[PDB]
Amino acid sequence: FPVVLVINCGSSSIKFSVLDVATCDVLMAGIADGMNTENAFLSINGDKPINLAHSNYEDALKAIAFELEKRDLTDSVALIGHRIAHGGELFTQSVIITDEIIDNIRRVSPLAPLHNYANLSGIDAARHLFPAVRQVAVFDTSFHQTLAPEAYLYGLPWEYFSSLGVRRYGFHGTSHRYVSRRAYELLDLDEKDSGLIVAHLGNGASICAVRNGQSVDTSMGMTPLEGLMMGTRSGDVDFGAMAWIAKETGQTLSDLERVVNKESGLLGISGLSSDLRVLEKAWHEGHERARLAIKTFVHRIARHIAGHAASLHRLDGIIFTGGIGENSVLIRQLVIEHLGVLGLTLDVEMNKQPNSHGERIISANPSQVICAVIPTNEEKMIALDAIHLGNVKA
Amino acid sequence: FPVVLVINCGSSSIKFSVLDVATCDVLMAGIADGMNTENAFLSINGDKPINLAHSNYEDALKAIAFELEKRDLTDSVALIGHRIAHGGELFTQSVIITDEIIDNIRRVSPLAPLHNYANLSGIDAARHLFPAVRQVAVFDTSFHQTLAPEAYLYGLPWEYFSSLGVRRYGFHGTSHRYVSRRAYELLDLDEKDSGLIVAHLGNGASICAVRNGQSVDTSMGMTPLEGLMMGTRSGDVDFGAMAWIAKETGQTLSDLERVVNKESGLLGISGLSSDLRVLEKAWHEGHERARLAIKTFVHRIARHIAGHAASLHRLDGIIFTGGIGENSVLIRQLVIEHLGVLGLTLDVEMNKQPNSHGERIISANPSQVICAVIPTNEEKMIALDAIHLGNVKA
């Protein structure tokens, strides 16, 4: 029974999963946190953190490989999948990693300096430790490459796009792609004749319009700062307002970039938490700013769901996914009730059901548009691409 | 026959109109251009520019008053209407100008330093030259004050809103208000039970959602930089992208603010013109970048029209207004065809009709939503507020 090793290298951690090729089931999962710091530890399935002390990306991947060996599945690793943050314009699909690909990843790495260079460090490590294993790169931007110029061009001077490559790229592509495929089965839709809106709500929040199997619009921009308001991210923000704050408080562009990424969003408005479970409980206890943060969060999602619907000839489905989208009974209902204009009617018995019920339809019968919850599986989608590319001569 | 003098003071010009109280008809109109410069001239109805040479706001208003006297209508001026750019949170409706109002205008003037201080200079001048005449302030933001916190709060730290007043204000309020009123008559709608989308396309471009006579969402933000892409303005732009350009080109926040306001938008993408008539002709001659600029322009309008529709319980009408919205047969159709999801069908015979046909319905019969063109009259709306306030004890 061969397996796929899925690796996601962040700036501060390394997340990994081992999926069984036969059933696409998770056999092992873990996180190597506190990366590049003075203290680095490795937890597997939450099985008590084991430290390495001042360890790098290569040493951490070697520790995971040693734990991979302790369970006798090292020689069973047939494929290695790498999650890549930014693929620029060069990558439209998942590819088998070669010297050419690496060079191309380094080319578009300036577009995401924090995340993309960390991905390359993971590629270099896995190459060193598993050279006779086929390795695959899956890009978080590639799905959105089917966008037309009108959908990705910014109203900036053309030169920024042609010379520097300033345009909408969009993220959560792997998730949007996975959820799309599942929606055609759950809603019983013909891919070649369909219009979906996928709402990935969780860590980061993004919307995607999927027309006839292709991504036609997405809420995130060149960076994950554009679009929906998030946990700590501001979302859509007037540049004039940002320029006004820079003059009135005397802050640098770096200072405001810190504020927008880490001090804003749900955390910013409420002044309490970035976690939704905390804010839901706070509002339940009569916290006004927690109510406002959630109400604003809901509003901007509804605004973008209806907004992205314009890039469709016909609206068949709205799919909720991600940590928030799969679990929050409240957020789903408030968003759908905010979208009464589109002729949606919700089934509250179905919307009450917890995530254990998996891929479920939550809209009632008289509804013009089918509303559904589909749990996203980014690890399975990476594995599926890897399995497909595992049958290929390179 | 008493008259209303309407004054709009920009940073570089003074636009004025004299409307007859009885019929709300324009009797005289002119522009004093090149304000505060070494050479300032005054044109009335395009009746050959007459220079004053190095003239200020008070001297220019005195020249208009002298030309007002030459036509024997100085003693006929019953009311003076002032267009004010930014009213902050303090002004929800048009008011009679007193010492209190002036102080309050200066309070919120930091929110629009370029335009708002010029408005005060016009107020000071008209006070000096017409002290026994009732004077009224009409605010370009006041109509959007009915917005709920979820619609105007940014995903920034709460402190920026509470201390500095960073929130969505929105503009074109006078136009959105005027067009709304007219729509209830043209579409035969009950104000208290209606949902409209008003698309003001022209100089600046903004969208407004009008639920039951009240503004519930608007595309422009704290500054007119947010929302739709415009002639020279970028519109919605990823802050992460703007921060990325600042690092890669080594430009100041002031440099990028210049680029976004004057070098971007339709002019930015095409690299040709901010004027739509030029770009329409250019695309007709096979100019690709003029086609892209227009296609992108259309796309962002459709995205925001459908987006703002979420803030409505029911969509009754989409109204096109402004220089572009009233005249561009192409832009109207491309936008409506982009909004096929909402179930709109256009009557192309009606959409062909030039602006001379005034307030006209452009959608066919099977259409789910009525599409119409209503010419905006910001001068008439200012006069109407002034006439109403002219019957009041102060």
Ligand SMILES: Nc1ncnc2c1ncn2[C@@H]1O[C@H](COP(=O)(O)O)[C@@H](O)[C@H]1O
């Ligand atoms: N039962 C729940 N109700 C509401 N929000 C939840 C729940 N479980 C997880 N979340 C949110 O999901 C987010 C995590 O997103 P993700 O990284 O996609 O799992 C966190 O910000 C949580 O606030």
Ligand SMILES: Nc1ncnc2c1ncn2[C@@H]1O[C@H](COP(=O)(O)O)[C@@H](O)[C@H]1O
């Ligand atoms: N016949 C027309 N066709 C297309 N665009 C027009 C036409 N007339 C005026 N415009 C546009 O309207 C804008 C002026 O807007 P406004 O200041 O609202 O009159 C300009 O940018 C013109 O490009």
